[PDB]
Amino acid sequence: MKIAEIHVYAHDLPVKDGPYTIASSTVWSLQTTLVKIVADSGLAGWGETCPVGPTYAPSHALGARAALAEMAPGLIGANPLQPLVLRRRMDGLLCGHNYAKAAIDIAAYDLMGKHYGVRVADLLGGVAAERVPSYYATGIGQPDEIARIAAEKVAEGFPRLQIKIGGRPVEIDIETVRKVWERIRGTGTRLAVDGNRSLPSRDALRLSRECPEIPFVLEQPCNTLEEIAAIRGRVQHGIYLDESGEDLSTVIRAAGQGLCDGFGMKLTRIGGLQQMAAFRDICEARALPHSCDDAWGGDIIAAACTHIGATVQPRLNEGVWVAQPYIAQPYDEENGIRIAGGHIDLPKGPGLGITPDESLFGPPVASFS
Amino acid sequence: MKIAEIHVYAHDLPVKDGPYTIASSTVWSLQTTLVKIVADSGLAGWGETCPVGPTYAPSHALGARAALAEMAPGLIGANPLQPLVLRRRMDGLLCGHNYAKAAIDIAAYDLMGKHYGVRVADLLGGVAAERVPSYYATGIGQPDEIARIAAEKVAEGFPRLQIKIGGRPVEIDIETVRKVWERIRGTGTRLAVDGNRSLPSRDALRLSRECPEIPFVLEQPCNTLEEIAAIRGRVQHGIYLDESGEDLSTVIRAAGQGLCDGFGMKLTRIGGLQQMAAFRDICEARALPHSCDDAWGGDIIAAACTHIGATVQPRLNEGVWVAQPYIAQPYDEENGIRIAGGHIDLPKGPGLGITPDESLFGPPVASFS
Amino acid sequence: MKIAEIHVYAHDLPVKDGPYTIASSTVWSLQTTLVKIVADSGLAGWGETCPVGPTYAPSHALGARAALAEMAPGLIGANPLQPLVLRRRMDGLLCGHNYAKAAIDIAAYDLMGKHYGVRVADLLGGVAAERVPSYYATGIGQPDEIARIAAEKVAEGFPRLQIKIGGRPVEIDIETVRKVWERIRGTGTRLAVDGNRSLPSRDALRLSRECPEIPFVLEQPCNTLEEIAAIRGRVQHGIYLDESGEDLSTVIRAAGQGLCDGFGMKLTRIGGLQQMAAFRDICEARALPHSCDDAWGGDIIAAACTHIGATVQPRLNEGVWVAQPYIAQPYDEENGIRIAGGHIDLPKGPGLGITPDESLFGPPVASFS
Amino acid sequence: MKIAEIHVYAHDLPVKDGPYTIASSTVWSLQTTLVKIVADSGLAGWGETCPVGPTYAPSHALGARAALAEMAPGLIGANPLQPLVLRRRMDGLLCGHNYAKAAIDIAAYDLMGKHYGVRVADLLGGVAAERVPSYYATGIGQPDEIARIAAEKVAEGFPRLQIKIGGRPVEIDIETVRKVWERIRGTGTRLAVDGNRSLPSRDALRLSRECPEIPFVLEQPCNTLEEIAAIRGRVQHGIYLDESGEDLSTVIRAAGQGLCDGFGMKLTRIGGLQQMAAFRDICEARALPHSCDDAWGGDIIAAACTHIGATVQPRLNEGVWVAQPYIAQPYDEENGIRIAGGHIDLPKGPGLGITPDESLFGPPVASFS
Numbered sequence A, B, C, D: 001m002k003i004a005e006i007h008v009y010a011h012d013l014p015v016k017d018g019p020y021t022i023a024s025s026t027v028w029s030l031q032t033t034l035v036k037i038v039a040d041s042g043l044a045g046w047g048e049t050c051p052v053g054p055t056y057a058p059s060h061a062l063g064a065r066a067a068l069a070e071m072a073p074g075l076i077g078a079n080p081l082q083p084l085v086l087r088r089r090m091d092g093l094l095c096g097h098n099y100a101k102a103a104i105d106i107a108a109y110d111l112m113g114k115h116y117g118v119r120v121a122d123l124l125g126g127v128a129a130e131r132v133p134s135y136y137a138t139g140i141g142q143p144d145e146i147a148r149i150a151a152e153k154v155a156e157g158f159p160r161l162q163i164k165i166g167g168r169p170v171e172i173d174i175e176t177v178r179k180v181w182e183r184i185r186g187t188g189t190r191l192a193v194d195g196n197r198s199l200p201s202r203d204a205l206r207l208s209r210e211c212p213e214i215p216f217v218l219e220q221p222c223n224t225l226e227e228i229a230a231i232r233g234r235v236q237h238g239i240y241l242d243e244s245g246e247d248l249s250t251v252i253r254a255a256g257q258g259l260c261d262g263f264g265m266k267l268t269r270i271g272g273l274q275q276m277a278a279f280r281d282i283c284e285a286r287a288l289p290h291s292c293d294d295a296w297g298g299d300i301i302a303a304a305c306t307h308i309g310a311t312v313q314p315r316l317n318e319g320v321w322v323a324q325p326y327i328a329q330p331y332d333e334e335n336g337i338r339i340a341g342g343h344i345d346l347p348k349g350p351g352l353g354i355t356p357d358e359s360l361f362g363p364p365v366a367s368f369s
Ligand SMILES: C[N+]1(C)C[C@H](O)C[C@@H]1C(=O)O
Pocket: A022, A052, A137, A162, A194, A196, A242, A264, A293, A294, A295, A296, A321
């Protein structure tokens, strides 16, 4: 098999009842980028990458499209059924830019699954669970209001909550954590507190020191991995990496040196499913719980996240986060990814199990053959 | 003296009022393996190895018999009165497989003791105590029920309890520990909490962080020694190794680098009494308390554990655990190992002090001469 | 699809012009164990595991068959198209025993490849090279004798030589290394020197110190990883792990903490292709060169090694070692694995590309349904 | 059985063709202390301790007798057939003073062996070799003079030489090492260079740096273990501890943290055979070569060293050093320890196999009942 065409699309996703606030990024609408790979046989696969604003991570929508335009001519003729070979070929065309490479990677797995008649999760080691947990991430807000929302989401069925903090005096974050805990204690709901790179070590230390009785994991409290390595010995709560886990080498450093207790891992950041599967295997060997998330995006990226998440040993699965609740229009109304009772049912069809209504995207901003 | 015959037996041991639940293994009946060594003089010694299900450790009943069948022809003619020489000879025939080698080792010490007219404990440095402490290990269950059982076992005389946890949400484990402590506090009963390799560092950290007022030692909370080394600086409760202590080299690493505060050590895992005695000497030099246990098994392995345990400095002796309370039929009704008042009286006769009713075992599954 | 039957075979492999001498194992004839998995449809896949004598590693032929006998009944009905799910299922039946699990893993990948019509290497990320390099490993022998063989094998086309040392005064090992280097310098041939766990740190230090001008990597010079970590900073030659690389967790330690510069890795030791592929991804992220070998065995295990080897980035591929030159009768007369010009061609057919002549093995020694 | 009497003897040992020059002690005549333990039955065992002058180690002849006088009354009635119980009993009477405790330890093993009819080596795991290697240690002297003696002693059969250095400009030590190497290279003789605590790190660094082509191990180059840990990474020669190995705890530190590559170990320093056997097991698990020596003394301490030495794995046995060549009158004319061909035959009789002629010692200087 050979790649015959690659099509790049720009598409807009407004935030229902926004904005969505992260200590490092507030957005009102997201620009996603879709990739369609067409084989010489005519069969097509789909990928997607959607940064959550331009300030969250070293990635942005215009940059995704620039990266894809750089690599695409060099990929025409490649065998899309060989994800590692294909990844090396991308590396031969452009250094870094995992978030763009990930879209090609995901399209190729979709195409592979359709070709062989198999679900992507089964190409990645096998379906361990047909329905996977999700988690709900609150925005930054008034303590009482965040606690109210947390209670509601637990009642909806979410087995885990992530409370966003930072960008304001830490006393308010601590009050938020305490008020949330008062409403969810004794429900068995797991808790994460995400500083999104915004806390000086001063405040990360204070948060943990003041709340030993509250069972959160502290997710990416500080900006750099060096700062996290420096506070870890003095912090009695588990610490998870998110933004710092930028590649497999960094994950190997963190696992091998005992620098964290788990991960919030994004598919596009790590470079796609080929790398994410290796990431999964590393975490399983070391009993490091993790989520399988992305920054944002619709059915295509969400299905890719759900497929890898379906392969995770259940006791290590911290959930699959998706932007679906904030997206008005699905790409696939019959099989698209939907949260139900705080969980996500894996699509049942071949490949990603998603057939996007291509009409929605508009003509490609760039085509290659 | 020379070994003239080696006989290998398969024998079944059903669990009274089971199953017995460990986070890593639930069993309903155990398959033990017995070894009889006959000297040219006609004198015989007995050994035993009995994994606690095939998933607890890298060992199983069929594997024990395969290992013994591999080594046995190469041991005919060896001097059974030289335990170190004999161990090196085994190593010359098969790499690893300590749990099988241990059965030959124990049979040889039994034979040595009978030949010289001395108790095995006196071959291992001398009887420091005629009666040794034991400890009772609970299964995993409802918090209140486990607390009730803990109170009963303290009333029976057990000076130490081990609470098994893991394989479920850690909130339940923590509730169990708290309810047990409420019933046993102020009795002077020592407490261990055994995660049996099942806790991610996330949960080990939480358990310790939440319970500074409860004086447990945390036994093998995490799967690998690397994970334990990573959490140790952040855990204020003593940490003991069990499954990780797979050989004397590992014990030397753990003692020399300060990676743990004690051990739950199994005779078969370490490779027998020759190695266990060295283990004992290392712990004594570093004031590291430990038990002398095994995975399971009847009078033969239990007596071997009791003999080495009788040599331990009393202040370091965390007890000898035996499967006797879960075994309906003793091998030796006159001198077999029995728990009385939470303690074990050392047999008074030469060798292990045990004469098994060989009839019980059936014909050997393999014989060598 | 579901596993309907599992059949275990025992088969002898006489060493051509024997014996083969490793510092830890001298072998005259090897006992291989073959496994055939049959699906409900009748489609079959083949696996193989063959310890290189019982003292090289904690593995042996009788032990392989005992482990398979323990696991097989619990695998009837499993889906063989899900290698990770299947591996966890095996872990739920027996702890450890990777060398036995690997035979099931390999048969399942063979079956998967046949079912989808794809080569195993293309189920593991894709073929990076159709012609895979091998390496020649000399046995221990006299310095001039070994230097001759080294020159002869370089001429035959092998791009890398491994010289086995140990088990005798180290000055003889050093003389051998110097005389081999005299023959092969200027031929572009890479050099490994394998101590096979046999050198005290005293001697490993001496070997490196005396030979800075000879560009060997020192493979598993000492018995334990702890010993290797202790000399590493005092050794100017690259150090590779072999025997110490017992599982993915240990690989993560070694890579993350920088304890070695590469690996000799055996498929059965790591537990099969699912784990080997993850191992490959770990090494690629850290630019750690490695081989894809096994202990011994015929066309089945050799094809498995060749398929994973064909996925390795060429600049990191230290070779695929196979026992074929020492094996008189191939299982597959037409398409079995053969070394040609010091290299190995990847088979063309689906699955492993091997069709064993079952009549060579005799009837199964154990059958499960 | 019970100790009925303890008798302490003082005896002079003139140095044949004296003196003997160590960087830390020059000696013309040594004051040995013998101990006879008599059981209720009248059976007796013998021990010995003989510091090599009062400045080599924190031990001296008057100190040996004072320590024995302190402990002896508290040992009347003890069971001498339990070496570990007996050792703890001594610890309960006097802290430290291993060199004195060792004399009691050795007499008790002698008695035990006589009582059971077994050789001491067979009470310590078993005889691995009937003929034990020794090593020759040169005194400090002129480079050409020492090189001659080195050649002469190699011819006599010693498989290892130890060259003493220090106490003068290091260039003279380096010249000595080079001239010795010139004589013994190509003879298969192993080389140790002993600084006896006398080199500043400045000079130890220089000695190793200048001589990479000379295969010595550097024994106790610096005064403290702290100094040795500090230079270790900058020294390419193996480093052995001698004087720093004061107890089992320090051995555990050195081995567990990889601070040395072997030991010169003295029986009296470590505290007797009970501790020496544990020391042996520690070294065997880590492939650390070691000698079994003492400071000085006649047939009694020499036989004790020979018996433990006969249990050491041959590949790790650096030799048993004894003072016999410097001692005119043996205690046992028939079966005393004698070096022959640079090796020592293990005595055949029960216990140590030595029967001292008591009349040589004079009446006891102290008797206890
Ligand atoms: C993955 N989230 C839950 C959604 C946002 O993209 C960021 C947030 C996190 O940082 O974990």
